[PDB]
């Protein structure tokens, strides 16, 4: 019978999959964790057995009746084997996007700058610029970093990126997408299952939905941190202008985390942010695993693996080996479960631990389910696990009880300002980032932003969905998406956004079957097994239910919802909008840091831009020489040109950037040389 083949043929590949998984998984792990020639060879070549592998499957899959199965277990496994991916793309254009991949990663993860004043002096985006864009409180440093990265390292990425578009969307365009962002978007599809389908398009309205649901808090949020950051960086940000993008913690502004040393509402109060805590005690990465790990096991879920703490990385190498320092979480295959993260000894390593811990207890409960199902439900479920258990290990509650807050720590309503100020500023900070990140890729993708347009759109978007403004005009030789770790390294994002959402409906039907009794925000899920088991019970399935219903049995809802994400953050709410009484509300999109320099301009090529902004460069360097009796190398970098028969120009010096010419000065030496023509 077709079943009873079937069968056997699923048990088959299953089994054969699970062992070539296993062996590109481990292989991608020693590039990840010892970047190497070698381990790049390694890798390309156990990824090319297990993908030549797919294809085989996916064409002897093909046979098998793709309706008439018996146990729709049996069919869904078929659908997908059925899929013949990558190999859409010749064997030329195969290898040439696996070699575009390994160079965007390899680009991302070893890219450095190096200071003008030492040019020997060089800093890795991993620890040196995130150490400066986290704990920098000079505005001048801080633009230096984030440019830097952008122009040594994005620049690099380019090119690479304009192709990677191509391949992609001619390998999702052939897998029968209408390209690679629809082919993203399938991860969240359901078909077949009446009051639980779910389209591709529909997760495009959801989010746009919801989106403007937190838009309010959003942008009271907006409103507080850019009046917090007047005070932190005075002159240098209109009352009613974006925040611009090198004041906001890290190296994108992806969280506002970081700015909570400058931003905390009840400074005089014990500190809720206990990175001291963790430095003043003996806390190192071990510990930190060893904390997410009790938080699991009380509870109820198993312990970490011997394998994992054997084959895991929690700590920096050195300067022994390059690694990929971003936690990441792995599931090799075979009881292998592992985690790549360069832990410090900060809050924020803390919470990133149960997080990354969380992907591994998903991994291990679905372990006992088909290969092909072992996966999330979708892969925001997946993202939403450790955030739910970061959501309690975040509580003063929590934390008082592990030793980091004092014993006496008294919970008053300026305290859980504080704490639900601080979630928010990861939180809610992110969730525009996200939607306007993805937004982007998935427009690139359909084709609606074409290649000479790609930064200029980039930075619409953010002035306008994000409140955010560059601080440094950009050209289309920039790819700021990319010097993002999940745009080089070629990973989907809206997983962060709907993640978002589910983690409080989750964290709403887990405390009440925790007995919580209060407001959501004071819940610590700590020691019930009546909450771990509810979860439990729905990891255990992997992707074998669709993720609405999985939803349902969690939740009581098919779908997201941001009631529960807006419930948590009703104090706060209020309370912003209370302390912004007296601050603008929502952002112009005009105002920019450069712009009040910049002076306007009266067959014309890119060739006449260089031989323009050499000119100036030149007429700099004799109004230096004359006007001032300096001699300064200003070149035709030093020239920033925006909103370009019309452009806008201003002046910096070399190896400052920060340091723009005042506009008077650039004028008189237009006008000294404006005899030269
Ligand atoms: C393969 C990917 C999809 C993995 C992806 N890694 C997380 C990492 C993480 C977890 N909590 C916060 N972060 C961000 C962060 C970045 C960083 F460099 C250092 C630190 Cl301490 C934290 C992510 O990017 O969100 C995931 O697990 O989703
Ligand atoms: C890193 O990779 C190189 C080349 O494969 C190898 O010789 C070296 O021993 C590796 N180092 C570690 C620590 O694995
Ligand atoms: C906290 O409580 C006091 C009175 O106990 C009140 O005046 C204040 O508005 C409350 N909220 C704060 C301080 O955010
Ligand atoms: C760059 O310019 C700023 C302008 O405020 C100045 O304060 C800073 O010292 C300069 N840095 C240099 C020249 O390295
Ligand atoms: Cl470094
Ligand atoms: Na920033
Ligand atoms: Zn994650």
């Given at each position: ?526 020691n019930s097994t009546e909450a771990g088991q509810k979860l439990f019970n729905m990891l255990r399935l992997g992707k074998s239910e669709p993720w609405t219903l999985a939803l349902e049995n969690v939740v009581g809802a098919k779908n997201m919802n941001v009631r529960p994400l807006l419930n948590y953050f009703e104090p706060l709410f209020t309370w912003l909008k209370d302390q912004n009484k007296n601050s603008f509300v929502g952002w112009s999109t005009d105002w920019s840091p450069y712009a009040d320099q910049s002076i306007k301009v009266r067959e014309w090529n890119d060739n006449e831009m260089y031989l323009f902004r050499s000119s100036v460069a030149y007429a700099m360097r004799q109004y230096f020489l004359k006007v001032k009796n300096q001699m300064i190398l200003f070149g035709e970098e030093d020239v920033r040109v925006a909103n370009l028969i019309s452009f806008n120009f201003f002046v910096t010096a070399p190896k400052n950037v920060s340091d723009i010419i005042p506009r008077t000065e650039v004028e008189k030496a237009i006008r000294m040389s404006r005899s030269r023509i």
């Amino acid at each position: 019978t077709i079943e009873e083949q079937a069968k056997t043929f699923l048990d088959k590949f299953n089994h054969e999959a699970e062992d070539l998984f296993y062996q590109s998984s481990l292989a991608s792990w020693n590039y990840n964790t010892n970047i190497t020639e070698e381990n790049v060879q390694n890798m390309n070549n156990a990824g090319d057995k297990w993908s030549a592998f797919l294809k085989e499957q996916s064409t002897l899959a093909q046979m098998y009746p793709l309706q008439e199965i018996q146990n729709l277990t049996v069919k869904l496994q078929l659908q997908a084997l059925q899929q013949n991916g990558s190999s859409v793309l010749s064997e030329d254009k195969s290898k040439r996007l696996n070699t575009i991949l390994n160079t965007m990663s390899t680009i991302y993860s070893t890219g450095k700058v190096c200071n003008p004043d030492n040019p020997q002096e060089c800093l890795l985006l991993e620890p040196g610029l995130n150490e400066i864009m986290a704990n920098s409180l000079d505005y001048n440093e801080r633009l230096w970093a984030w440019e830097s990265w952008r122009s040594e390292v994005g620049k690099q990425l380019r090119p690479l990126y304009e192709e990677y578009v191509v391949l992609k969307n001619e390998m999702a365009r052939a897998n029968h997408y209408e390209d690679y962002g629809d082919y993203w978007r399938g991860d969240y599809e359901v078909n077949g299952v009446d009051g639980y389908d779910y389209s591709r398009g529909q997760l495009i309205e959801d989010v746009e939905h919801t989106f403007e649901e937190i838009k309010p808090l959003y942008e009271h949020l907006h409103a507080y941190v850019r009046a917090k950051l007047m005070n932190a960086y005075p002159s240098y940000i209109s009352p009613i202008g974006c925040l611009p993008a090198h004041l906001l913690g890290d190296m994108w502004g992806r969280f506002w985390t970081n700015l909570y040393s400058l931003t905390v509402p009840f400074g005089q109060k014990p500190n809720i942010d206990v990175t001291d805590a963790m430095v003043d005690q003996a806390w190192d990465a071990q510990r930190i695993f060893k904390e997410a790990e009790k938080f699991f096991v009380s509870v109820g879920l198993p312990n970490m693996t011997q394998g994992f703490w054997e084959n895991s990385m929690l700590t920096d190498p050195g300067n022994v080996q390059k690694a990929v320092c971003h936690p990441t979480a792995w599931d090799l295959g075979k009881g292998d479960f592992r985690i790549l993260m360069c832990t410090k000894v900060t809050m924020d390593d803390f919470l990133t631990a149960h997080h990354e811990m969380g992907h591994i207890q998903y991994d291990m409960a679905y372990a006992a389910q088909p290969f092909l199902l072992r996966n999330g439900a979708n892969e925001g479920f997946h993202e939403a696990v450790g955030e739910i258990m970061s959501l309690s290990a975040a509580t003063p509650k929590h934390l008082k009880s592990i030793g980091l807050l004092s014993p006496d720590f008294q919970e008053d309503n300026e305290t859980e300002i504080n704490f639900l100020l601080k979630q928010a500023l990861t939180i809610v900070g992110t969730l525009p980032f996200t939607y306007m990140l993805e937004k982007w890729r998935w427009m690139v993708f359909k084709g609606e932003i074409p290649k000479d347009q790609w930064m200029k759109k980039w930075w619409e978007m953010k002035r306008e969905i994000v409140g955010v403004v560059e601080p440094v005009p950009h050209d289309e030789t920039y790819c700021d998406p990319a010097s993002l770790f999940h745009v080089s390294n070629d990973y989907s994002f809206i997983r962060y956004y709907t993640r978002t959402l589910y983690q409080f409906q989750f964290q709403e039907a887990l405390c009440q079957a925790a007995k919580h009794e209060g407001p959501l925000h004071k819940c610590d899920i700590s020691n019930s097994t009546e909450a771990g088991q509810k979860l439990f019970n729905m990891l255990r399935l992997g992707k074998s239910e669709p993720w609405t219903l999985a939803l349902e049995n969690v939740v009581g809802a098919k779908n997201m919802n941001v009631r529960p994400l807006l419930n948590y953050f009703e104090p706060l709410f209020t309370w912003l909008k209370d302390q912004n009484k007296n601050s603008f509300v929502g952002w112009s999109t005009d105002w920019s840091p450069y712009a009040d320099q910049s002076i306007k301009v009266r067959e014309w090529n890119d060739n006449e831009m260089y031989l323009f902004r050499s000119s100036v460069a030149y007429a700099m360097r004799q109004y230096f020489l004359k006007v001032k009796n300096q001699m300064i190398l200003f070149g035709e970098e030093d020239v920033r040109v925006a909103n370009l028969i019309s452009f806008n120009f201003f002046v910096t010096a070399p190896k400052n950037v920060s340091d723009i010419i005042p506009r008077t000065e650039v004028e008189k030496a237009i006008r000294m040389s404006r005899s030269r023509i």
